Design a binder for this molecule. Structure first.
Ligand code: MET
Length: 519
């Protein structure tokens, strides 16, 4: 299928200012989308804000402001944060958007028409902060904002309240077997594997029907009305999930403004998403509810959901840390340190260790060596002579790197991808140290040609595969190496030897620093 590669992030509640967590989830989305662009693929990356609901309404009230004013303000904060963070997201959707509201009504009507929505009651627990329905097995004892007894969610520890309302119910129970068939027929669809196992376990125990409307008073009328029943408002999560479907049907300005909503998702060739990036805290909504709505509506299911280890929505300001330590470096650190396990050492100490250790010493030092006037005296890419077995062994590593990094990026496990690239980087260092090209300038010019060219090409290819992570710094590196633009993207330039000998390096600004060491 030739289609637009469609990668999304969650859309974040606007009850508070954007923080780390939002920046991480969108960072992952950004990176995946950036990697597919360097492969020369069509990409559409989506991010945005979740603006309706009781949670947000009550946050706006607590600040003595109108919901319209409050969502617009916080959303603007989110837009400023993501711009400052230097992403490359193709569109920023808001659920207050009028074109979005129309897709929600369409989808609602489609589910109703398919027979999958009936009027019933929900009587049970609810976490307003998580906008989540919970069974009694999922709550426990706690304390409110005053030490007063109360019940909280096991999931998140937020206060839960009992709800007894006549609600429109979605027939989630009817989709249990079809979802299990989906999980098993596509064992890559949920990443990492242990979260794929969790979802299956849960669906296997059985599924209750899901409330998809609420009484309009309860939401403070800050919500999308149920089509043909203005007493009710569409559940914030059904509303929220439809974000993905909406964004797949929006034609976008050259300045990121929606200008048109197309009738049919096929028209823009984006739906269904090839990867949903989410945090572990919103797995049920994306891996159970979402495909059930889509199976009901006759729509196509996503290909991959990847749930990382952070808590999506919840001492570290992203922009200030990036001002201190560097943007690409901060992004690199976040991506390198965490797996699907949120047990990352995020201290200033470990940030500096990785900055100095890997960015400055492994990669930075290596770039400076092969470009320096000491070693590379003609400031160009040499023609290599004959390769020795040690030469060939390093070359093999470089030739194998792209296919390996590619598979990691596609899982997606971006940490593993970085580790693979830096293994090759550590090897190239060991080769350089072994060959001592600095001594070779004098002793053996022909030998140097070989060592230097292999060093250049290794640095080029690692840098290319590192470019979705270090997008500003890779441009600097390519500039230093003198790599023509056309060679900076495309799978054509994954191949060893795509930049010809004789290519001149780019001027030198000997106020160096690729990465300046710290503390
Ligand atoms: C459809 S993504 C919804 C995510 C939710 N608004 C959150 O912030 O966790």
């Amino acid at each position: 299928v030739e289609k637009v590669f469609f990668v999304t992030s969650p859309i974040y509640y606007v009850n508070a200012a954007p923080h780390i967590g939002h920046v991480y989830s969108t960072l992952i989305t950004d990176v995946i989308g950036r990697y597919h662009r360097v492969k020369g693929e069509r990409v559409f990356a989506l991010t945005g804000t979740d603006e309706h609901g009781q949670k947000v309404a009550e946050a706006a009230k607590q600040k003595q402001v109108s919901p319209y004013d409050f969502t617009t303000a916080v959303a603007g904060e989110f837009k400023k944060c993501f711009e400052q963070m230097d992403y490359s997201i193709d569109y920023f959707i808001r659920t207050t958007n009028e074109q979005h509201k129309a897709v929600v009504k369409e989808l609602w009507t489609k589910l109703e028409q398919k027979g999958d929505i009936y009027l019933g009651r929900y009587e049970g627990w609810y976490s307003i902060s998580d906008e989540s329905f919970l069974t009694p097995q999922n709550i426990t004892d706690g304390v409110d904002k005053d030490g007063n007894p109360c019940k909280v969610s096991l999931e998140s520890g937020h206060v839960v309240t009992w709800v007894s309302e006549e609600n429109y119910m979605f027939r989630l129970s009817a989709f249990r077997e079809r979802l299990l068939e989906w999980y098993h027929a596509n064992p890559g669809c949920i990443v990492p594997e242990f979260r794929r196992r969790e979802v299956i376990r849960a669906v296997e125990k059985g599924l209750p029907d899901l409330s998809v409307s609420r009484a309009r008073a309860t939401l403070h009328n800050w919500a999308i009305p149920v089509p043909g029943n203005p007493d009710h408002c569409v559940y914030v999560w059904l509303d929220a999930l439809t974000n993905y479907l909406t964004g797949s049907r929006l034609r976008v300005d050259e300045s990121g403004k929606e200008v048109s909503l197309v009738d049919d998702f096929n028209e823009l060739e984006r739906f269904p998403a090839d990867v949903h990036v989410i945090g572990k805290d919103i797995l049920k909504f994306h891996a159970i509810y979402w495909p059930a709505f889509l199976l009901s509506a006759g729509l196509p299911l996503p290909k991959k959901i990847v749930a990382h280890g952070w808590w999506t929505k919840d001492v570290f300001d992203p922009v200030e840390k990036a001002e201190e330590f560097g943007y690409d470096a901060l992004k690199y650190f976040l991506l390198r340190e965490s797996g699907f396990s949120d047990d990352g050492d995020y201290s200033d100490k470990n940030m500096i260790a990785r900055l100095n250790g890997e960015l400055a010493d492994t990669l930075g030092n290596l770039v400076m060596r092969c470009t320096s006037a000491k070693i590379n005296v003609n400031g160009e890419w040499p023609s290599p002579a004959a390769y020795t077995e040690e030469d060939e062994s390093l070359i093999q590593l470089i030739k194998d790197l792209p296919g390996t990094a590619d598979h990691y990026y596609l899982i997606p496990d971006i940490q593993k991808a970085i580790i693979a690239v830096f293994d090759v980087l550590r090897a190239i260092n060991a080769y350089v140290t072994d060959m001592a090209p600095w001594k070779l300038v004098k002793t053996d010019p022909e030998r140097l040609r070989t060592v230097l060219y292999i060093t250049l090409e290794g640095v080029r290819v690692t840098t290319l595969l590192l470019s979705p992570i270090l997008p500003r710094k890779s441009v600097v590196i390519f500039d230093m190496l003198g790599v023509p633009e056309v060679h900076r993207k495309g799978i054509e330039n994954f191949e060893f030897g795509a930049v010809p000998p004789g290519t001149r390096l780019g001027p030198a600004v000997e106020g160096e620093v690729l990465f300046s060491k710290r503390s």
